[PDB]
Every structure is written in structure tokens, then in C-alpha cells.
Chain A
């Protein structure tokens, strides 16, 4: 249960519920089946929340890692329809769980800010500066490796 969420990979509720259903509910604590908070009967009240959490997490990882994905691919993972996802998207962004913009076409999800001149500008400076720091550092290591004891 810990290992799946920690590794950022795309998943879906449909598989997640069935599997964990057998593990968590069965799990011997001190010794009994009971542990609650998404395991047993009482645990079911908390479990409902777990579904919502999978869908906030799927949209988050895809947002961070990718910059564009289609809305049809996104829905399959979340286990929503487009009309259902769209409602959910309006409230998520307001709390600031994620930043994402979805359309009605289901052509695309822009997980970046729209292509305005400032983002392009910003990246272009950062790319330049990193190279210059790296070329300096490598020359210092290289100098020892070359000369050495002067046995070669």
C-alpha cells in the first residue's frame, strides 16, 4: 500500500480497490482483523475518502511530470467521465491541490501556463547558466587525472 503511492506511476481506482480490499480488511494488528480507518466496517466510512485521494494524486503526478496530455487518456485513469471530471476540476483548482486546465473538446490538458512569452524567456536563461557552472567543475577533476604522479 505504501510502495504504490510513493512511486509516481499512473494508476487507477478500479484495480486499487479490489486488491487492497483483501489485504487491509484481513490484516492482523495486535492479532485481530479489526484496524479501522479503511480496513473493516467502521473503516469503510474512512475508505470512501480513499477513492477521492487516488484521483487528486493521479492528476497531480501527471501535472508535474508531463506538460500536455489529452483529456480522454486522463479520464480512463481517474475513472470519471468528462462531465464528472469537469466539475471536480473547478473545486480542486480553488483549494490549490493541483494547477490544471481542462477543456470541453477533450483535445488537451495544459499542466503548464499557456504559451505566453514569459515562460519561454525564463527557461532560456536557466539553460545557459547551468552549462557554465558544469564546464568549470569538470576541468578541475580532469587536471588531476591527466598529470597524476607522472608515471603514465
Chain B
């Protein structure tokens, strides 16, 4: 069923908000367990705009993979109900509540395809963290493996962005004790962006690095992708070079 029809994923402030609330609302079922909900939104659009979410009961084991409970009833009743109000909004998929992508996810996804016309895996890293965004988008891709069995189900990442309607943005400001954070703006913001970029880069490099130690000893697989990426850094050898300055600024204040 459609997961391949999404290149780009945009999320309203609402969805990020809604998920944290659902976690408590189910009767405070967590810890090892997670809480899932439906995502309602668009599809047959290259841009996926997830409009809303509403709570669903769920018990997850992510240390096993031969047990999970997923409420069947909620998905169906909710898809049938919703058409009258909005004919475009259908069940877009489900959010996973961190900490990162699992292979544990393919299994839960499969069921969601059957029930729901669409599914998508949006992973919201746990309870509120970070200044920027904590959502990543994944679409389940079917690939051949040239060493195992063709038709394996795995997750490939797709670009995650945000975006929302006018009325909703206006709501955020009212509630909130500021407006938004950094991504680029004023003279101050660009420099912050630079510092934000360094702490961010550093996190990506730790993932690779901890993995290599684990592959070398502890025998995690050797994949061509990991090795390809590392080699390039040494090869390209960037060389510092001239340019990009200007002196104009003083004349303008003098004139004024």
C-alpha cells in the first residue's frame, strides 16, 4: 500500500505537540511501552502535510518482535468516520516515540498498511528535547539484497521539514512566550546557526565512530556504504583560498 509517494515531509506544530500528550492520556502506559496514534492528513501529494493526530491505545515491546498489541478497532472506525468531514484526510500513518529507527519498526508498519490506506513512519524523539526539530521521516522501501533473499523490507530516510496553515502559526505565538527558534534570520541568527551547525555535525560523526568499534570487534556487519563515506574525506583534501570581503559599511552611517 502507498508509502512510495512521499519525497518530502512537512509537519504542523500540532503534531509535535499532540504526540507528547497522547503518551500520558492512554492511562500512562510507557517505559518499555510506547503510545501510537493515527496521523490524519493528505496523500497523493509529493508533499506530505500531516494535519492532525488523535490518540489510539498501544502496548509495544521493542526488545522482542513476536509480541506487540495494536488496536485494530480504532484505525478502521476512524478512517470510516472521517470521510464526511474531510475527503482528502485519511490515515497517513503512525508516529514512533523514539529514541531512533529500529528494525523492530517494520513489523508494526505492515499491519498499518493493511488497515489504513497509507502508512508512514514519523519518529519523534522521546519527550521534549532540543531547540530545533526532533522528527525524522522514513518510507519503507523494498530492495533486493544480493547476498540474502530479494524482497527485504527496510527503511530509507527522506527529507524532514515543517510547514503549517496561517491560523495555526498565529496560535503558536499567542500561547508561546516568544516566537520560534533559529534556522536563519537576522545578523545574530546567522552566527548562531554556525555554532548550532558544529554541535550538530559532531553528533553525526559519533554515530559512525562508535559503530566502527563495534564492527571491528563485536562483529556487526561491514556495509559498503559506511566505508565509502569515510574514504572520501581523506581524498578530497580541501585547500583554503582567497576572497569575500567588502568595506562599504562606514560611508552609509556618515551620510546619515
Contact = CB atoms under 8 A, between A and B. Distances in A.
Q: Do chains A and B touch in the complex (CB under 8 A)?
A: yes
Interface of A: 117, 120-121, 124, 127-128, 130-132, 134-152
A127 B236 contact: yes
A144 B242 contact: no
A121 B101 CA distance: 39
Interface in B199-256: 201, 203-205, 207-208, 211, 214, 220-221, 223, 225-226, 229, 232-233, 236-243
A79 B244 CA distance: 48
B131 to A, nearest CB: 18
B104 A135 contact: no
A93 to B, nearest CB: 29
13 contacts: A120-B239, A124-B238, A130-B236, A135-B208, A135-B229, A138-B208, A138-B225, A143-B100, A144-B101, A146-B100, A149-B65, A150-B63, A150-B102
B17 to A, nearest CB: 24
B207 A142 contact: yes
Interface of B: 62-65, 100-105, 136, 138, 154-157, 201, 203-205, 207-208, 211, 214, 220-221, 223, 225-226, 229, 232-233, 236-243
Contacts of B232: 130-131, 134
B19 to A, nearest CB: 19
A145 B104 CA distance: 11
A146 B211 contact: yes
A28 B214 CA distance: 63
A120 B241 contact: yes
Contacts of B243: 121
Given A131-B236, A134-B229, A140-B101, A151 B65 contact: yes
A124 B241 CA distance: 8
Nearest to B61: A150
A145 B212 CA distance: 12
In terms of DSSP, what is the predominant structure of the interface of chain A? helix
Contacts of B103: 144-145, 147-149
Given A140-B101, A140-B157, A144-B154, 6 more contacts: A136-B204, A140-B156, A142-B207, A143-B101, A145-B211, A150-B104
Given A127-B236, A131-B233, A142 B226 contact: yes
B107 to A, nearest CB: 8
B205 A135 contact: yes
A139 B102 contact: no
A150 B102 CA distance: 8
A131 B64 CA distance: 37
Nearest to B62: A150
A139 B204 contact: yes
For A136, A144, A148, the residue with the greatest tally of chain B CB atoms inside 10 Å of its CB is: A144
A76 B240 CA distance: 39
A121 B226 CA distance: 29
B241 A144 contact: no
A1 B225 CA distance: 37
Nearest to B197: A132
